[PDB]
Design a protein around this ligand. Structure first.
Ligand SMILES: [Cl-]
Ligand SMILES: [Cl-]
Ligand SMILES: [Cl-]
Ligand SMILES: [Fe+3]
Ligand SMILES: [Fe+3]
Ligand SMILES: [Fe+3]
Ligand SMILES: [Fe+3]
Ligand SMILES: [Fe+3]
Ligand SMILES: [Fe+3]
Ligand SMILES: [Mg+2]
Ligand SMILES: [Mg+2]
Ligand SMILES: [Mg+2]
Ligand SMILES: [Mg+2]
Ligand SMILES: [Mg+2]
Ligand SMILES: [Mg+2]
Ligand SMILES: [Mg+2]
Ligand SMILES: [Mg+2]
Ligand SMILES: [Mg+2]
Ligand SMILES: [Mg+2]
Lengths: 172, 172, 172, 172, 172, 172
């Protein structure tokens, strides 16, 4: 048992390792999306930039959880980072829709983690998740929903003009 | 169901609409108080300024709740904003006493909202209320109590000199 | 009778209290419109910003009338602020049309108030209304008319691309 | 009953008085440690500086709890501040080990306080403890563990060179 | 015997340890007074600020004696810091009167310490006490006397207006 | 066939996809090493910083290859990022030795890629590898070799003083 460990359940420690892996997976999904928009046959530079930013933000999310694991005296166990579900993301609209679904899934995982920290009477961990993760997820989800809505209302994905103009005026 | 909605109970959504209305009501109470002190037969300019600031702060409180409703995928339903309970607030002391009672009532509503968010296992909403509302209410209530105490100790409301001097030295 | 009161008819006093309420109603209508455009299924952030500005400007219009009432020795009597006629504003174009109708109804009230002040031989009150309100209304009405025209010519509300682009290039 | 008091259980109020005393005790322990390292026969100036900083931080912790007691309408009852358990702290390693044990004991007290605030449905108090105390304690404990580890790995306390070099390179 | 010790009598060493405790007691008395004035039912923020400053100055007075003990090769032995004689200080005037008595009792201790240092032919210790403590005590006593006089002449403690105005104009 | 593709053999495309994966693996290995040194029972913060920098540099190396694949009209196919071979890196010296082996294995991959590009008469690809990767690998290998040498000469890993001092003076 680590000299620093106090009020930190084994189940919590295991759940934080699972969460680390999910944040790293999200970073990888966004990396894939970014470079799909960099293809010469897609060529939406501001979609590419938006998703590369999101990828680097998710890596920060993962590192902060690694820091937390060590702060509490848990032990980091890394797992393979699974490739994304697609290699071709089809369109700007579809990529936004997929991102929205990813962020809801990551939020579900975080909510389940909070419920476990609540059940184990770990207020530090509950505060960590609330302070650093839950409102980030609500903001992300809202932003992605807004983007999906605009793209749909503009006529995407069948209008290539719509996706072009959104790239310029919203993401640029 | 909104595309962004996740872990957001209908009861919570309804309670946030009620809270919006209460914050707007508080803004209106303070507006009324401000312009009572602007009367030529009351003429306490720093009481007027203090309560106008409080009115604009309460409007911000209401707008942040409207933003939250949309962030979570709830739907804003506005209701009439009821006029305050008085048209003549009698004195600087009485207005402070009434403000103290208003802020305790708004805090009770917020505490009931937090209990509902707890019961519905909505940690995001609990964090929102704690972060942005509960300590604002504790500080407000403490400040108002301090003002009531000083005004009483100085001889208000029968001493018009007391209210004059408090206006200058504490509120000015 | 207030010690400051001079040449201020009771009918004028009562009409100013009605005007205060109407300005506060207009503020509330614009607040409602603002947060409709903040919904995730509407998501036009510059429409939201535009209407939130207008909301805050109408609050200032009410506050200036409250100040006037006290300047002239009238007594403020606040009334409830009725909720707007819609909860869902349908589209950018519809909201602009509704705003245009609201501003013509507020102008009609102000013109009736000026007629009263004229009939009661109150030149200070006539000057106040002219200086601070009547050209503000003419400018607002003209701006809203211009916005309605552009949205219609662009193809709104059926073209969600029209409303998107208007949000960006006119309101942004 | 104070005019400001709302949702603040007598048990909570009593627990905050106990916590005030513990923070003041921790400040005193660190004061003692600081001046042990200032002895001519110990003479580790950066150990002395490190522990004097910690002592002044603990006094701030105590004052913030006193402020909270008054904010909520409780009444401060101070108790004697007990002298530390040692007069001679033996070594840099031993002092760090003792500090680590002190901070775990203070964290246990805070966790028990949070459980009481949870049981009494006092979300303001729970937020106060999470926001201002629990992560401060986790960081402190982690830092102290890191220092203990380095000192041990370097050969302390039997190596006086180890303690000298740690004083210079980590604490200096 | 410490390698630095020279001309430092055991009785002087022991008296310095008593003085350290007394300075830390004085710090605690002022801390208690400060937060009495922070209560919502007292609410004199400049009395609170004044006494919190004095609290921090007495901690520095203790720390300087701890430094001296080590400079001369004496050994620090800390004792418990007894709680003050009151929990409720009654009024601004009463607290000032109590402070004046505390500072005359600390001065008497210091004068007894100087007599000891004189009787043990310790000119370094006599100079230390004179340079750093005796005029500080004379200034403090004179300031407190001045504050007591003004409060009494103004009508305290029966006049809560007196204490309010003193808080503002002398302590603010 | 992409409209941009010219002189880019399928084998080269496929080898670049393998290289992307290997760079992302290297990033993950360094991330693991970093947070091993952040453990409370290891506690070498400059080893942690060093390896976290290397992690971020390997992510940039992967991103540049992804950019290249699109520049040449190849198609990115991501694969899972395998977890590192250890969870516990044992010591500063062992981690450096493991890193040195990792960088020689990445160099061997790059040299095989250059041979392929040479055999397919792809001078643009040869130049890319030389300009951006081969001297980076030589510098990295040389730096790691230098670090291994110093740690061994200092007495690592048995001397925890050696690793402490290396952390401070070379990596700090
Ligand atoms: Cl355009
Ligand atoms: Cl005065
Ligand atoms: Cl060295
Ligand atoms: Fe994330
Ligand atoms: Fe509020
Ligand atoms: Fe208006
Ligand atoms: Fe503390
Ligand atoms: Fe003193
Ligand atoms: Fe690389
Ligand atoms: Mg993001
Ligand atoms: Mg306020
Ligand atoms: Mg919180
Ligand atoms: Mg306007
Ligand atoms: Mg009504
Ligand atoms: Mg500390
Ligand atoms: Mg003093
Ligand atoms: Mg005792
Ligand atoms: Mg490198
Ligand atoms: Mg696999």
């Amino acid at each position: 048992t680590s000299q620093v460990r106090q009020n930190y359940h084994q189940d919590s420690e295991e759940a934080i390792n699972r969460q680390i892996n999910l944040e790293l997976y999200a970073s990888y999904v966004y990396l894939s999306m970014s470079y799909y928009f960099d293809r010469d046959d897609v060529a939406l530079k501001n979609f590419a930039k938006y998703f590369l930013h999101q990828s680097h933000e998710e890596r920060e999310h993962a590192e902060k959880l690694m820091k937390l694991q060590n702060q509490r005296g848990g032990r980091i166990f890394l797992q393979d980072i699974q490739k994304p579900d697609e290699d071709d993301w089809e369109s700007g609209l579809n990529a936004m829709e997929e991102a929205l679904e990813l962020e809801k899934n990551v939020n579900q995982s975080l909510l389940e983690l909070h419920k476990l920290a609540t059940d184990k009477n770990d207020p530090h961990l509950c505060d960590f998740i609330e302070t650093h993760y839950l409102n980030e997820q609500v903001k992300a989800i809202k932003e992605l929903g807004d983007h999906v809505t605009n793209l749909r209302k503009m006529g995407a994905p069948e209008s290539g003009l719509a996706e072009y103009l959104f790239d310029k005026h919203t993401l640029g």
